[PDB]
């Protein structure tokens, strides 16, 4: 009934469907009152054989609904959705996820890197502005 | 009665959390988090956290707060406003820990990283701004090294 | 409660944002009157696990506001 550690990576597709890699915490303290059941129909390796899959499922579902930018221009929503979904998930397996959030997170490369380049080269603009003055 | 040996010794826990910042540069920031189990709620803290309460609270609330804050500033805006970043991280993490009877005196960012590019161009701008000067007086030098050739 | 040595390098960006590398001294003598707390919620390795990060934070913030 400790909130043992369970970090569960996930490789899903965002709403705009850039390949997003997110990990999550399952801070599971098996419900003391439900441990009878958490051994009848959950067993000794309750966490290792209950929690990782539900985490992957919930996290993929949450990620599917936010674009690559939208996932973290609103990450608080994404992490909270995954967290409360996983908490109610572990509740049925006699598991009190006292907290959950997105350990890891990434996307593809260039929806990622080109809105970056957008302001990169607004300064490359000054770089060339001033290489002009060198050529002069 | 069992002696409940709380390590109310502040056990600092240096904990790393990779971040996609506000603009979502991959910034990795660690945080040395200085937790004493709040004395005035220790017995509830043992019905609630136990003896290794610290490994039971800090390890991931640290990463929570690191990520939450660092994901509210651009790549540079973290370097430029790292004071704001560390202050917000501590502000959120102290209340995260105090829930389970943990008084954080200190929560401070120990490191910060990026790839380079934002800061690379940002440095190169002032590099070249004065490279201009570096070669203006060379323009003059040459205007006059040409009456050499005259 | 000695002002033990704590040199903490920093690699930040100036106002014009040339990569500036600054180190700083934390000449910390833990408050005698507050040491109870400096062990409750700060602990034995108070300096090593409190001071370097705050130094980095403050120094980066200060550097951000002045050109090279």
C53:B110 CB<8 A = yes
Strands (E) in chain A, as ranges, are 7-13, 19-25, 28-29, 96-97
B108:C58 CB<8 A = no
A70 contact partners, CB below 8 Å, separation of at least 6: A14, A15, A16
Resolution of this model in Å is 21.0
Q: Is C64 on the interface with B (CB under 8 A)?
A: yes
B20:A105 CB<8 A = yes
Burial class (CB in 10 A: 0-12, 13-18, 19+), B114: middle
Are A22 and A9 a contacting pair, CB within 8 Å? yes
Residues of chain B contacting C, Cβ within 8 Å: 8-12, 14, 31-32, 34-36, 39, 76, 79-87, 103-106, 108-112, 119, 122-123, 125-127
B128:A69 CB<8 A = no
B96 contact partners, CB below 8 Å, separation of at least 6: B57, B61, B64, B65
Q: Which residues of A touch B117 (CB under 8 A)?
A: 116, 120
For B16, half-sphere exposure in the C-beta direction (CA atoms, 13 angstrom radius) is 7
The partner residue sitting opposite B12, judged by closest CB among C17, C45, C64, is C45
d(CA B97, CA B8): 13
Are B70 and B29 a contacting pair, CB within 8 Å? yes
Q: DSSP letters of B14-72? A: EEEEEEE-SS--EEEEEEEEEEE--GGGHHHHHTTT-TTTTTTTHHHHHHHHHHHHHTT
Report the residue of B42, B79, B91, B93 to disrupt the C interface, i.e. the one with the largest count of C CBs within 10 Å: B79
- Which residues in A47-81 are b (16+ Cβ under 10 Å) and which e? beebbbebbbebbbebbeebbbbebbeebeebbeb
d(CA A112, CA A120): 13
B34:C43 CB<8 A = yes
Chains that touch A (3 or more CB pairs under 8 A): B
- Which residues in A97-128 are b (16+ Cβ under 10 Å) and which e? bebbbbbbbbbbeebbeeebeeebeebeeebe
d(CA B34, CA C48): 11
Strands (E) in A2-130, as ranges, are 7-13, 19-25, 28-29, 96-97
Q: Shortest CA distance to B63 belongs to which of B11, B15, B13?
A: B15
C57:B83 CB<8 A = yes
Q: Shortest CA distance to C22 belongs to which of A55, C51, C61, C4?
A: C61
C52:B32 CB<8 A = yes
Q: Is A110 on the interface with B (CB under 8 A)?
A: no
C40:B119 CB<8 A = no
The partner residue sitting opposite B10, judged by closest CB among C13, C17, C39, is C39
Start-to-end CA span in chain A (Å)? 74
Alpha-carbon gap: B105 to the closest alpha carbon of chain A (Å)? 23
d(CA A3, CA A58): 19
Q: Which residues of C touch B130 (CB under 8 A)?
A: none
β partners of residue B54? none
User: What does each C-alpha distance from A69 to A115, B73, B80 come to in angstroms?
Assistant: 9, 14, 23
Alpha-carbon gap: C51 to the closest alpha carbon of chain B (Å)? 8
B82:C67 CB<8 A = no
Alpha-carbon gap: B149 to the closest alpha carbon of chain C (Å)? 39
Phi-psi region of B36 (alpha: psi -120 to 50; beta: other; left: phi over 0): beta
Question: Could you tell me whether strands B11-20 and B103-109 are parallel, antiparallel, or unpaired per DSSP bridges?
Answer: unpaired
């Amino acid at each position: 009934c400790r909130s043992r550690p369970r970090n569960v990576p996930v490789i899903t597709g965002s709403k705009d469907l850039q390949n997003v890699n997110i990990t999550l915490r399952i801070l599971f303290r098996p419900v003391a009152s439900q441990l009878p059941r958490i051994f009848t129909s959950i067993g000794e390796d309750y966490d290792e054989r209950v929690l990782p899959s539900i985490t992957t499922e919930i996290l993929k579902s949450v990620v599917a609904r936010f674009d690559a930018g939208e996932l973290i221009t609103q990450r608080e929503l994404v992490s909270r959705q995954v967290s409360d979904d996983l908490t109610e998930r572990a509740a049925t397996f006699g598991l009190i996820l006292d907290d959950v959030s997105l350990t890891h997170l990434t996307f593809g490369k260039e929806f990622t890197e080109a809105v970056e380049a957008k302001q990169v080269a607004q300064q490359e603009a000054e770089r060339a502005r001033f290489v002009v003055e060198k050529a002069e | 009665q069992y002696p409940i040996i709380y390590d109310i010794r502040a056990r600092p826990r240096k904990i790393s959390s990779p971040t996609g910042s506000k603009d979502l540069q991959m910034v990795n920031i660690s945080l040395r988090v200085l937790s004493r189990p709040n004395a005035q709620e220790l017995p509830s803290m043992y019905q609630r956290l136990g003896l290794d309460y610290e490994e039971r609270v800090l390890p991931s609330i640290v990463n929570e707060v690191l990520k939450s804050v660092v994901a509210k500033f651009n790549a540079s805006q973290l370097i430029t406003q790292r004071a704001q970043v560390s202050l917000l991280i501590r502000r959120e993490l102290t209340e995260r820990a105090k829930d389970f009877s943990l008084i954080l005196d200190d929560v401070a960012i120990t490191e910060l990283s990026f790839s380079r590019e934002y800061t690379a161009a940002v440095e190169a701008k002032q590099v070249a701004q004065q490279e201009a000067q570096r070669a203006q007086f060379l323009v003059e030098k040459a205007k006059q090294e040409q009456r050499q050739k005259i």
